[PDB]
Amino acid sequence: GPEQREIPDVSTLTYAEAVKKLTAAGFGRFKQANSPSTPELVGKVIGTNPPANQTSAITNVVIIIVGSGPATKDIPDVAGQTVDVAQKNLNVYGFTKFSQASVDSPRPAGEVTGTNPPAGTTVPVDSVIELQVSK
Structure with missing residues (x-):
């Protein structure tokens, strides 16, 4: 098994999903940001720096950007x-x-x-x- 873990693709659905699943993936290092974007997608992750398709070392800080609808x-x-x-x-x-x-x-x-x-x-x-x- 690699030192890299795969990022769950449920993040796209909801921030709550992202955190819980990513937490279950072994990640505990996060950096959270939110950016004003399309209001109907509020509360979901619009992108993470570590990709959901690639594996990232668990020593990496996951930068998670939430879609903010002001x-x-x-x-x-x-x-x-x-x-x-x-x-x-x-x-x-x-x-x-x-x-x-x-x-x-x-x-x-x-x-x-x-x-x-x-x-x-x-x-x-x-x-x-x-x-x-x-x-």
Whole structure:
């Protein structure tokens, strides 16, 4: 038997599968990374550095990359309503981290004038949205 062990091809199906089977293969040295990719493949391994078809020495660090599917949303238009009410509606369908930018109030005041990124821009929901409010 070689010092190299074969990497199970169940990794492709799920990270959980990868780890358990690879653990049963004798590997205990891992390096994990995840990269944003096609959301419908979230949680599965999208690639390992040691191949599933070749045998790799068990002294090797297995670099396992997980397919990460982030929650992203387009910032909607909720301008024309109050800062408090706008954040509330937007939060339900969008983001939880807000920042406020003061813009000059000609006629509207207190009400949301718009968003920092142009409406329709899709960004990670974990990212901070800046709301343009009439000071």
